[PDB]
């Protein structure tokens, strides 16, 4: 109950809420069925329109009108946008030269230049460049301010997880917001666009700006419009909030426009009908940066320019039926469209079975235009998992496709011809940066960056400390002129043995065999310089990675590579080798095929054996630094040793091997020299963090030998490819993945065929951030370079996506 019966007057759009059953003037009401009976007249008036026509110059105030051209309006803080244009003789903000804001120029009372976050839902990065001719305000603060080409969502590509991640710098998974759509079993509620279960807080996770802002004494505009508020009021509110006393005004201000999506849906990305929501998004940019002008803000405050996701063609007749592949159809509640999420219809039915459904969903028709999954072995790189409103059984859909349980949901529910929430490496998915103010860059171009690295920048602008988060704080340095934050490394937490030979060869009973017995003051002298680190500098060219955790682990030097070897998982933790461009590949020879040799650094008891994978009948073995790459036929035995083995599925060993013997080669032939690091991953709770040894779920048979989720690799070049990978005098490149360690190959349909049809086009599904793998494995990477930390941290957040051209 809300007692309509109070008044809005001089409360219009009121910056606190009151609490039913007390009438609500803010800008939410609406939304609520709560506003005062006199909100419509009082905080919605129309009357004349939103621009000054020279009629109106220095009219009566009149207070019926929507704003005013009247002598008394910019002290009231209440002019139409274009009043100094039509009535004082002033040019438009865009007409206006750019010119660099190097300090902030604010009036004064002003503490701090405020923030202003105008945000579109559905606009597509392209739009930039394809609908330039039409956006004259926000070309001028693209080309003017600091601007990245895209911004990469987050996972779905979908309106609420991704304003929420922008928000809170989190993945959906962490904040809660998993879809437009969830169930959540615990609270046995469910979440919708339509209704009033979505306003509950427990829905929402993290801790979003406004609250952030609150807690550290910041004050905030409210950040959300009910739909029915238009455009020009949401523009004339924030200015008028912006003349209010100091110590009332808020500090952090959020635009945001349904446009281009809401058309975008209606006719695609780029029907003839999206020019004009285009032109009009413009026009409100151009009305909010005149009313800043005005104001003399326009070079005071920081304004970001900024969407939620993309939008791609998706029509009717392009929708894969559910009931075209099973047979208990009513059995399952599907969430479906550009995703789908899969749980039983009824927990008291114990028929259903996700193993059986999910194989009559794996490759069953030539084009199938969805692939299924549990959702423990999604891609990482979407961090897509660690929620009770995540279903395990996930269909991640093609591009330009969608998925439903019956046709009959289709037609009973073409349309639409646009759609969004496909994976968020899909080029039209990508969305927009801009930021244009005097603490962002002047005409500065950045990389692609993904939308949770944002909150810590916001927080960097407003002069908050962020909390607890997702971004990786300092990677988005270089878009700032100040106000850049400036971390240390993370300490490392365990060092490293260095174990010289303290083992005979008959300490070891580990089942293990190798043709090896083949015999020098010229060689022996050599090979003990290479167990010592002679040839590390080649193979360990950032430094050795940081173990962050609490761990006892051996440093073991070889002529080819490098490795941390855990005593505790039995196997390295990374391997680092270096491959030039010039480097052979060979073949295992025919005597050393089962080779395996003990390592006399490393106690009997902190090694694996041979026996267990012999006992094992799943589980085979493969090695982190590959026979393959040998220098010499005499550094092969290295590659050989007990302590360079990892287990692995045969079918995975296909993947492996190909990688191995086909793809690094073809790396460093292409790179000029890659530097490779290798390693297993735990993540049996797919939280994307490191498993302690309590957590892992499956041993190699009779054995304490842990067996991986994950097998990851980051491979790192000269960013300049005429510089070999050994000897780089500046910027890195680098491209990881983080592959799901499983028993088949079901994921891949055509993994029948030759390694050379199917190995890479999985490795660049299951592409990943350095940072990702930081997560995974509690390591820290490029500890020693020749380069700034925060550049460094831009390198590990990047990801390589093997897109085309946006
Ligand atoms: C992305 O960034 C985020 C943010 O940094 C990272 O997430 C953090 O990870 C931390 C480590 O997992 C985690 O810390 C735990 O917090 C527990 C208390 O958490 C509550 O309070 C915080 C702070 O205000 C709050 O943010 C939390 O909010 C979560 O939960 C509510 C719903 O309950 C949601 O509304 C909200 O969206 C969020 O959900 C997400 O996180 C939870 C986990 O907390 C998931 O379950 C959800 O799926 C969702 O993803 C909470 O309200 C605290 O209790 C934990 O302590 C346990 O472990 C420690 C080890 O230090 C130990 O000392 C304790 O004994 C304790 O163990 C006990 O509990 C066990 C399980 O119940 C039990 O087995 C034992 O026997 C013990 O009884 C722990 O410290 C932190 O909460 C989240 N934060 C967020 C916002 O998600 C995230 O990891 C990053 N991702 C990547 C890939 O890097
Ligand atoms: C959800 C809420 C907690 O957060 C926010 C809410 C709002 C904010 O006020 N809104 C109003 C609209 C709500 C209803 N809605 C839809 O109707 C919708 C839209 C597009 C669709 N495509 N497909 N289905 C769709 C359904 C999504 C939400 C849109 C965001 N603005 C925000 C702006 C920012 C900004 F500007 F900072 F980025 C940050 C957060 C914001
Ligand atoms: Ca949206
Ligand atoms: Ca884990
Ligand atoms: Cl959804
Ligand atoms: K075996
Ligand atoms: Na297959
Ligand atoms: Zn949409």
Sequence with gaps: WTATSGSCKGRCFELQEVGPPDCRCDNLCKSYSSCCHDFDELCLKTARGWECTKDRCGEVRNEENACHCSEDCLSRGDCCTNYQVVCKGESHWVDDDCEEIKVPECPAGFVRPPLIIFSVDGFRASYMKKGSKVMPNIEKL?????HAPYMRPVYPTKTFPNLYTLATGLYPESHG???????????????????????????????????????????????????????????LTILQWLSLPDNERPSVYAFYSEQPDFSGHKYGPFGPEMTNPLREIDKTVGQLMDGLKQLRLHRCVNVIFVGDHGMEDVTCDRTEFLSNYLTNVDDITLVPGTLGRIRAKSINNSKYDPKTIIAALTCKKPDQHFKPYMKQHLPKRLHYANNRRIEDIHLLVDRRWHVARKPLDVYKKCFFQGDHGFDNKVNSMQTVFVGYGPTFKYRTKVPPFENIEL??????????????????????????????????????????????????????????????????????????????????????????????????????????????????????????????????????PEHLTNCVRPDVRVSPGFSQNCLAYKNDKQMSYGFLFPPYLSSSPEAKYDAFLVTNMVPMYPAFKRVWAYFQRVLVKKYASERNGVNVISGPIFDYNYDGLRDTEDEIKQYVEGSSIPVPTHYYSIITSCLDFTQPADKCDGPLSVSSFILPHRP??????????????????????????????????????????????????????????????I
């Design 744 to 805: 088949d190959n079901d994921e891949s349909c055509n993994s029948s065929e030759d390694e050379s049809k199917w190995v890479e086009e999985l490795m660049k599904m299951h592409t990943a951030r350095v940072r990702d793998i930081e997560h995974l494995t509690g390591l820290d990477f490029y500890r020693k370079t020749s380069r700034s930390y925060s550049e460094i941290l831009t390198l590990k957040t990047y990801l390589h996506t093997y897109e085309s051209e």
């Design 455 to 588: 909150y810590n920048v916001m927080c960097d602008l407003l002069g908050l400390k962020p909390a607890p988060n997702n971004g990786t704080h300092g990677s988005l340095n270089h878009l700032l002129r100040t106000n850049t934050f400036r971390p240390t490394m993370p300490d490392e937490v365990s060092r490293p043995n260095y174990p010289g030979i303290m083992y005979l060869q008959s300490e070891f009973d580990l089942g293990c065999t190798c043709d090896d017995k083949v015999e020098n003051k010229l060689e022996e002298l050599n090979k003990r310089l290479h167990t010592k680190g002679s040839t590390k500098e080649r193979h360990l060219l950032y430094g050795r990675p940081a173990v962050l955790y609490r761990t006892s682990y051996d440093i073991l030097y070889h002529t080819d590579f490098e490795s941390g070897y855990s005593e505790i998982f039995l196997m390295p933790l990374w391997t680092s080798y270096t491959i030039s461009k010039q480097a052979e590949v060979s073949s295992i």
């Design 142 to 146: 693209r080309s003017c301010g600091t």
């Design 177 to 235: 917001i998993v879809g437009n759509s969830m169930y959540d079993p615990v609270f046995d509620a469910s979440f919708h666009l339509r209704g009033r279960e979505k306003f509950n807080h427990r829905w929402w996770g993290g801790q979003p700006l406004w609250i952030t802002a609150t807690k550290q004494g910041v004050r905030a505009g409210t950040f959300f419009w009910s739909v029915s508020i238009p455009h020009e009021r949401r523009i």
